[PDB]
Enzyme design. Sequence first.
Site, PDB file in Angstrom:
ATOM      1  N   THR A  25       3.939  11.793  -8.035  1.00 27.42           N
ATOM      2  CA  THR A  25       5.112  11.534  -8.911  1.00 27.42           C
ATOM      3  C   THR A  25       5.219  10.029  -9.212  1.00 27.42           C
ATOM      4  O   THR A  25       5.099   9.214  -8.287  1.00 27.42           O
ATOM      5  CB  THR A  25       6.422  12.062  -8.322  1.00 27.42           C
ATOM      6  OG1 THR A  25       6.734  11.247  -7.209  1.00 27.42           O
ATOM      7  CG2 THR A  25       6.346  13.509  -7.877  1.00 27.42           C
ATOM      8  N   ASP A  66       2.346   1.746  -3.490  1.00 22.28           N
ATOM      9  CA  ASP A  66       1.230   2.177  -4.385  1.00 22.28           C
ATOM     10  C   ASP A  66       1.010   3.698  -4.245  1.00 22.28           C
ATOM     11  O   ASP A  66       0.928   4.391  -5.275  1.00 22.28           O
ATOM     12  CB  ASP A  66      -0.019   1.390  -4.024  1.00 22.28           C
ATOM     13  CG  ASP A  66      -1.210   1.721  -4.877  1.00 22.28           C
ATOM     14  OD1 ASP A  66      -1.781   2.842  -4.712  1.00 22.28           O
ATOM     15  OD2 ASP A  66      -1.565   0.845  -5.699  1.00 22.28           O
ATOM     16  N   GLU A 119      -6.262   6.634   5.955  1.00 24.85           N
ATOM     17  CA  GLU A 119      -7.337   5.738   5.453  1.00 24.85           C
ATOM     18  C   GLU A 119      -7.490   4.524   6.374  1.00 24.85           C
ATOM     19  O   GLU A 119      -8.631   4.071   6.564  1.00 24.85           O
ATOM     20  CB  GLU A 119      -7.040   5.302   4.023  1.00 24.85           C
ATOM     21  CG  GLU A 119      -8.145   4.419   3.458  1.00 24.85           C
ATOM     22  CD  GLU A 119      -7.825   2.950   3.514  1.00 24.85           C
ATOM     23  OE1 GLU A 119      -6.668   2.567   3.841  1.00 24.85           O
ATOM     24  OE2 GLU A 119      -8.743   2.174   3.263  1.00 24.85           O
ATOM     25  N   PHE A 157       7.892   8.431 -10.047  1.00 23.19           N
ATOM     26  CA  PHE A 157       9.150   7.894  -9.487  1.00 23.19           C
ATOM     27  C   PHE A 157       8.898   7.357  -8.088  1.00 23.19           C
ATOM     28  O   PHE A 157       8.081   7.884  -7.363  1.00 23.19           O
ATOM     29  CB  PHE A 157      10.243   8.958  -9.502  1.00 23.19           C
ATOM     30  CG  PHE A 157      10.432   9.525 -10.875  1.00 23.19           C
ATOM     31  CD1 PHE A 157      11.060   8.792 -11.861  1.00 23.19           C
ATOM     32  CD2 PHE A 157       9.901  10.761 -11.191  1.00 23.19           C
ATOM     33  CE1 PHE A 157      11.164   9.304 -13.145  1.00 23.19           C
ATOM     34  CE2 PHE A 157      10.030  11.276 -12.464  1.00 23.19           C
ATOM     35  CZ  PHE A 157      10.663  10.542 -13.440  1.00 23.19           C
ATOM     36  N   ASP A 203       3.001   6.076  -3.127  1.00 27.73           N
ATOM     37  CA  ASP A 203       4.192   6.765  -3.709  1.00 27.73           C
ATOM     38  C   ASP A 203       3.991   6.911  -5.225  1.00 27.73           C
ATOM     39  O   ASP A 203       4.277   7.987  -5.747  1.00 27.73           O
ATOM     40  CB  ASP A 203       5.481   6.031  -3.345  1.00 27.73           C
ATOM     41  CG  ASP A 203       6.783   6.824  -3.467  1.00 27.73           C
ATOM     42  OD1 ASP A 203       6.973   7.471  -4.484  1.00 27.73           O
ATOM     43  OD2 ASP A 203       7.651   6.658  -2.590  1.00 27.73           O
ATOM     44  N   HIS A 261      -5.738  -5.629  -2.298  1.00 25.18           N
ATOM     45  CA  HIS A 261      -7.030  -5.674  -1.573  1.00 25.18           C
ATOM     46  C   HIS A 261      -7.355  -7.106  -1.142  1.00 25.18           C
ATOM     47  O   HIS A 261      -8.118  -7.266  -0.189  1.00 25.18           O
ATOM     48  CB  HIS A 261      -8.160  -5.026  -2.377  1.00 25.18           C
ATOM     49  CG  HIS A 261      -7.857  -3.596  -2.633  1.00 25.18           C
ATOM     50  ND1 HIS A 261      -8.456  -2.872  -3.636  1.00 25.18           N
ATOM     51  CD2 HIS A 261      -7.005  -2.755  -2.007  1.00 25.18           C
ATOM     52  CE1 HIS A 261      -7.970  -1.659  -3.623  1.00 25.18           C
ATOM     53  NE2 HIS A 261      -7.142  -1.534  -2.584  1.00 25.18           N
ATOM     54  N   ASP A 320      10.078   7.643  -4.872  1.00 29.80           N
ATOM     55  CA  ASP A 320      10.845   8.858  -4.463  1.00 29.80           C
ATOM     56  C   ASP A 320      10.378   9.438  -3.123  1.00 29.80           C
ATOM     57  O   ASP A 320      10.781  10.598  -2.815  1.00 29.80           O
ATOM     58  CB  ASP A 320      10.772   9.935  -5.545  1.00 29.80           C
ATOM     59  CG  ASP A 320       9.379  10.481  -5.810  1.00 29.80           C
ATOM     60  OD1 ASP A 320       8.415   9.948  -5.221  1.00 29.80           O
ATOM     61  OD2 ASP A 320       9.270  11.410  -6.607  1.00 29.80           O
ATOM     62  N   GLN A 352       0.871  -1.211   0.000  1.00 29.37           N
ATOM     63  CA  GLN A 352       0.000   0.000   0.000  1.00 29.37           C
ATOM     64  C   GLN A 352       0.893   1.242   0.000  1.00 29.37           C
ATOM     65  O   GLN A 352       0.567   2.238  -0.681  1.00 29.37           O
ATOM     66  CB  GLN A 352      -0.973   0.023   1.186  1.00 29.37           C
ATOM     67  CG  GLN A 352      -2.011   1.142   1.054  1.00 29.37           C
ATOM     68  CD  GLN A 352      -3.024   1.227   2.173  1.00 29.37           C
ATOM     69  OE1 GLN A 352      -2.749   0.970   3.341  1.00 29.37           O
ATOM     70  NE2 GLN A 352      -4.239   1.592   1.808  1.00 29.37           N
ATOM     71  N   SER A 406       7.466  10.534  -2.369  1.00 24.49           N
ATOM     72  CA  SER A 406       6.488  11.625  -2.556  1.00 24.49           C
ATOM     73  C   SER A 406       5.360  11.492  -1.537  1.00 24.49           C
ATOM     74  O   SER A 406       4.696  12.494  -1.296  1.00 24.49           O
ATOM     75  CB  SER A 406       5.943  11.703  -3.943  1.00 24.49           C
ATOM     76  OG  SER A 406       5.506  10.431  -4.389  1.00 24.49           O
TER      77      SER A 406
HETATM   78  C1  HEM Z   1      -6.688  -1.785   4.763  1.00 22.23           C
HETATM   79  C2  HEM Z   1      -6.060  -1.584   3.582  1.00 22.23           C
HETATM   80  C3  HEM Z   1      -6.534  -0.805   2.387  1.00 22.23           C
HETATM   81  C4  HEM Z   1      -7.562   0.056   2.220  1.00 22.23           C
HETATM   82  C5  HEM Z   1      -8.524   0.457   3.325  1.00 22.23           C
HETATM   83  C6  HEM Z   1      -7.596   0.486   0.861  1.00 22.23           C
HETATM   84  C7  HEM Z   1      -8.556   1.373   0.321  1.00 22.23           C
HETATM   85  C8  HEM Z   1      -8.530   1.845  -0.988  1.00 22.23           C
HETATM   86  C9  HEM Z   1      -9.509   2.725  -1.570  1.00 22.23           C
HETATM   87  C10 HEM Z   1     -10.728   3.267  -0.857  1.00 22.23           C
HETATM   88  C11 HEM Z   1      -9.110   2.988  -2.855  1.00 22.23           C
HETATM   89  C12 HEM Z   1      -9.814   3.874  -3.866  1.00 22.23           C
HETATM   90  C13 HEM Z   1     -10.749   3.042  -4.694  1.00 22.23           C
HETATM   91  C14 HEM Z   1     -11.367   3.817  -5.815  1.00 22.23           C
HETATM   92  O1  HEM Z   1     -12.057   4.831  -5.535  1.00 22.23           O
HETATM   93  O2  HEM Z   1     -11.203   3.419  -6.991  1.00 22.23           O
HETATM   94  C15 HEM Z   1      -7.880   2.269  -3.048  1.00 22.23           C
HETATM   95  C16 HEM Z   1      -7.191   2.297  -4.222  1.00 22.23           C
HETATM   96  C17 HEM Z   1      -6.014   1.599  -4.365  1.00 22.23           C
HETATM   97  N1  HEM Z   1      -5.506   0.630  -3.539  1.00 22.23           N
HETATM   98 FE1  HEM Z   1      -6.126   0.142  -1.812  1.00 22.23          FE
HETATM   99  N2  HEM Z   1      -6.611  -0.127   0.188  1.00 22.23           N
HETATM  100  C18 HEM Z   1      -5.924  -0.923   1.034  1.00 22.23           C
HETATM  101  C19 HEM Z   1      -4.789  -1.695   0.789  1.00 22.23           C
HETATM  102  C20 HEM Z   1      -4.065  -1.689  -0.379  1.00 22.23           C
HETATM  103  C21 HEM Z   1      -2.937  -2.477  -0.644  1.00 22.23           C
HETATM  104  C22 HEM Z   1      -2.341  -3.469   0.365  1.00 22.23           C
HETATM  105  C23 HEM Z   1      -2.529  -2.180  -1.946  1.00 22.23           C
HETATM  106  C24 HEM Z   1      -1.374  -2.709  -2.738  1.00 22.23           C
HETATM  107  C25 HEM Z   1      -0.591  -3.692  -2.338  1.00 22.23           C
HETATM  108  C26 HEM Z   1      -3.447  -1.191  -2.427  1.00 22.23           C
HETATM  109  C27 HEM Z   1      -3.394  -0.632  -3.645  1.00 22.23           C
HETATM  110  C28 HEM Z   1      -4.341   0.250  -4.126  1.00 22.23           C
HETATM  111  C29 HEM Z   1      -4.147   0.967  -5.396  1.00 22.23           C
HETATM  112  C30 HEM Z   1      -3.082   0.884  -6.422  1.00 22.23           C
HETATM  113  C31 HEM Z   1      -5.215   1.793  -5.560  1.00 22.23           C
HETATM  114  C32 HEM Z   1      -5.416   2.760  -6.719  1.00 22.23           C
HETATM  115  C33 HEM Z   1      -4.654   4.081  -6.395  1.00 22.23           C
HETATM  116  C34 HEM Z   1      -4.894   5.245  -7.407  1.00 22.23           C
HETATM  117  O3  HEM Z   1      -4.156   5.398  -8.446  1.00 22.23           O
HETATM  118  O4  HEM Z   1      -5.835   6.087  -7.214  1.00 22.23           O
HETATM  119  N3  HEM Z   1      -4.378  -0.943  -1.460  1.00 22.23           N
HETATM  120  N4  HEM Z   1      -7.563   1.549  -1.927  1.00 22.23           N
HETATM  121 CA   LIG Z   2       6.347   9.048  -6.200  1.00 26.80          CA
END
Ligand code: HEM
Ligand SMILES: [Ca+2]
EC number: 1.11.1.7
Length: 595
Positions: free
Chosen positions: A184, A108, A258, A186, A110, A351, A188, A105, A190
Amino acid sequence: SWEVGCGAPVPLVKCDENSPYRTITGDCNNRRSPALGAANRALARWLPAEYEDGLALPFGWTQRKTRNGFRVPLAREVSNKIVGYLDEEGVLDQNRSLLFMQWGQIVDHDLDFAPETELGSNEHSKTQCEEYCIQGDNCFPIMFPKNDPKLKTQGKCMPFFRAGFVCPTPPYQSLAREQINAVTSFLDASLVYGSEPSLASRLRNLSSPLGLMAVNQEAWDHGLAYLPFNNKKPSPCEFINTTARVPCFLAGDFRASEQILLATAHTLLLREHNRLARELKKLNPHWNGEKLYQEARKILGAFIQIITFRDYLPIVLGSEMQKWIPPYQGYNNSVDPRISNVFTFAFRFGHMEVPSTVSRLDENYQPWGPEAELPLHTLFFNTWRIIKDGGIDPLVRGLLAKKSKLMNQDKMVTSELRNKLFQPTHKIHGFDLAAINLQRCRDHGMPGYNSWRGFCGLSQPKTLKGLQTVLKNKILAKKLMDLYKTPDNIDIWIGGNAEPMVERGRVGPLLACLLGRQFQQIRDGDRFWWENPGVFTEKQRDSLQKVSFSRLICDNTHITKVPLHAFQANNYPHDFVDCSTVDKLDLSPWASREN
Ligand code: HEM
Ligand SMILES: [Ca+2]
Ligand SMILES: *[C@@H]1O[C@H](CO)[C@@H](O[C@@H]2O[C@H](CO)[C@@H](O)[C@H](O)[C@H]2NC(C)=O)[C@H](O)[C@H]1NC(C)=O
Ligand SMILES: *[C@@H]1O[C@H](CO)[C@@H](O[C@@H]2O[C@H](CO)[C@@H](O)[C@H](O)[C@H]2NC(C)=O)[C@H](O)[C@H]1NC(C)=O
Ligand SMILES: *[C@@H]1O[C@H](CO)[C@@H](O)[C@H](O)[C@H]1NC(C)=O
Ligand SMILES: *[C@@H]1O[C@H](CO)[C@@H](O)[C@H](O)[C@H]1NC(C)=O
Ligand SMILES: [Zn+2]
């Protein structure tokens, strides 16, 4: 025919060629193309966007518009029928700690954030979405299927707002809708320092020229520091306990609060920054604030890069690591460092690794008090449990000693996220992250499962029998076929996550390819990659090589028992050692002697 670069949402192009440090925005990384991997630019398109009207409307927008001749299934129906499960017994990953989930997380946040649109922060449009479940403009509500339990207790839908897109705030007909990356590209830090100069300055401790970050002047982790509070109101962290009235934290990233282990990870990175800066100062008394903020910021960026590429990625990608991310050959200014639109869904494999409970543990790594284990859903936007329930140390012991959830084709996403997710403005623990993910795939114009199989040189199932062999699961294949009708229509998030894991990894073949390509690109396309000659010295890299999450805990908490390998499943005290036996970060190769 085609242009190169729409955009008014550029700040100032002001590149110092001689700068030893990154910009905050990620501008000036690529000399030939300076906005490349900068924040507040379009996510990269590895494949053309697929929208219902070819331009901007998602698949599922118009009821009478098929995808490949079939209605796309309701996101919430796919979620109920395929993603959900009841029994948490036997779901835990027997060789991944909870920190493996948590680091995913962090990395992600960053790399990417596509924020929901704003053409109404003072509007009826705001609540007209939750209130009336009316689809229009940026309101794209997740409607409940007929048999949905939430229909009985929560109304007709889950409100959902379309992601922001580059160029114009309201309408734009220049080409296909491109979603923004607000951070960003990178790797990094951020998420610690911010991706905008303003936020970046709102966060630092300027009041001393020691190059430290601004701290909470109202609460400390018994001789440590807290992230400052965002004193902006209304606060979702206040709203979950109006008694405690503890605000959300203020980080380089607006998502830091969050959930309580994210807020914890972020706390340690504010604190680790100070530990490095003070170490730098005791060793280089002559260096001013900037050299200590910029230099401290550069070691932390290097720390994240190392932990991610040395410790994290190899146990995600397993037998596929070496294929996609071969040993580093140096910086390649022709590599595109931009995060792709698809990567922001691929990386949501995380997730399925989130378990249903979080624990607070003691120095014997034993239950901390009578309510030591808490349901995850009570911990969304929850800062009061850190400040008033014993700081971050007990949570950090949980990250080490507890396990991630294992992805399971029959137990995909815990009901703590699939039914009880809390979102700001909205008042319930009643959202479905799986459903949101599926709706967002469509919102972002994602190509379907077989477009992505094709992209990665993998087979493209066209029949039930096809899908069964690729997923190695008849029942799952049959449910997807009943909902989607053709595998061509399977949303990438559920398609990629449904594949059996690669040998010694935690994702299937398709995600291994998508994640692997992106990580290779953010390393090789990064002029400030820690190991690029001229970024660090041969001696620093012998010493930046020392870094560890095990060591980062030891050095910023009161924890004295840590595993060596903090991402593997570690059982106390058998797989735990004393902190003394853990290689420290010898900063002697940062010693400055000019005169
Ligand atoms: C308790 C843990 C976590 C919570 C509560 C959570 C919650 C969320 C929520 C609410 C979103 C936005 C969904 C949307 O509106 O489309 C999100 C997006 C995301 N989550 Fe999770 N998440 C969790 C854990 C993780 C983990 C462990 C990863 C990766 C290993 C991850 C990667 C992502 C990514 C990549 C996005 C999209 C980010 C973007 O470009 O906007 N999350 N998450
Ligand atoms: Ca970054
Ligand atoms: C910035 O740093 C200064 C110096 O490290 C902080 O002030 C110190 O912290 C507490 C007060 O919160 C005092 O007990 C110390 O003795 C202070 N020392 C000095 C030299 O002032 C200051 O709080 C930080 N500022 C912010 C906004 O975070
Ligand atoms: C730097 O990266 C670029 C682009 O990724 C590489 O260009 C590739 O060159 C190969 C073989 O010469 C060509 O067939 C391709 O057109 C390019 N790559 C892709 C992905 O299409 C370039 O070779 C890299 N430079 C070095 C020295 O590795
Ligand atoms: C609110 O926080 C207080 C401590 O500040 C705690 O005693 C109480 O149980 C909390 N209530 C809820 C509903 O979380
Ligand atoms: C657990 O994961 C590690 C990688 O961190 C691996 O080397 C080790 O063999 C694994 N243990 C088991 C029991 O599979
Ligand atoms: Zn203490």
